[PDB]
């Protein structure tokens, strides 16, 4: 029962239908690993500083999830098997630290 | 043939090698300190680098090229001289860029470099 932020970067040249298919697979993994969603952001297509899979752009997704700790390493692994998933990074949610 | 190319300058502490490439990086011609009749430590002098750059640029003009983008790798003695010789040889030098490869704490150096 702890909070995490899940960042996913996918193929940028993926159509709407395949994008929704991969979204449903991501949701299926999330439910299969006991994660509860609290917020979702979809920033879309962004230009990367360096090529990833020889591709200069990436499609981004950002989920706020709550799950038991012991499954976190498993879920991420399931998220890395798909050939269209370029990057998966799961971090522990942290309170904002403010300058000035 | 092409009027736009790239100029790679590889200036080690022992020699300066200049290559002219097509916009796809395929070389057209090259010249070094040994191509002019220098051997040994004289290959590392700034004047040898100036001559090598002038020779490579002259061959490039003989091929019919007018502008080159300059890429410099290494910190040898003949670096600035070669760059300046390219600047004043008859070629339009649009930009100069530094691209010397440095590891992000990678392989163990040789003893002389430790």
């Amino acid at each position: 029962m702890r909070r995490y932020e899940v960042n996913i970067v996918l193929n940028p040249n993926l159509d709407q239908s395949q994008l929704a298919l991969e979204k449903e697979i991501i949701q299926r993994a999330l439910e299969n690993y006991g994660a509860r969603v609290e917020k979702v952001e979809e920033l879309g297509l962004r230009r990367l500083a360096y090529p990833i899979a020889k591709d200069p752009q990436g499609y981004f997704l950002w989920y706020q999830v709550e799950m038991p700790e012991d499954r976190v390493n498993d879920l991420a692994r399931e998220l890395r098997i798909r050939d269209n998933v370029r990057r998966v990074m799961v971090v522990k949610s942290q309170e904002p630290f403010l300058a000035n | 043939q092409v009027a736009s190319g790239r100029a790679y300058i590889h200036a080690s502490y022992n020699n300066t090698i200049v290559t002219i490439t097509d916009p796809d990086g395929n070389p057209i011609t090259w010249s070094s300190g040994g191509v002019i009749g220098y051997k040994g430590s004289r290959k590392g002098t700034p004047y040898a680098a100036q001559l090598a750059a002038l020779d490579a640029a002259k061959k490039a003009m003989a091929y019919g090229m007018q502008s080159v983008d300059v890429i410099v790798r290494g910190t040898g003695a003949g670096r600035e001289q070669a760059i300046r010789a390219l600047q004043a040889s008859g070629l339009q030098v649009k930009s100069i860029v530094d691209d010397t490869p440095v590891p992000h704490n990678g392989c163990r150096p040789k003893k002389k470099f430790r």
């Binding site: 500083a49 360096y50 990833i52 904002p96 630290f97 403010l98 300058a99 | -």
Partner: protein
Amino acid sequence: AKVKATLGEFDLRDYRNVEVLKRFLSETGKILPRRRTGLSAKEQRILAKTIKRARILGLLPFTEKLVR
């Protein structure tokens, strides 16, 4: 002429705020020291950790070629 000085309030742990975080990089894509920036030591530690996170995510660069 300090990066911290010429900015408003922002999260130091935010690893998606590319526009703000890129101000804390040199021309070649290197993290600035405390001299250039003006943050405290703890703030600099947080900034470095977030910059590395954003580098891994593919937003900020690892290195950029020096241009004269």
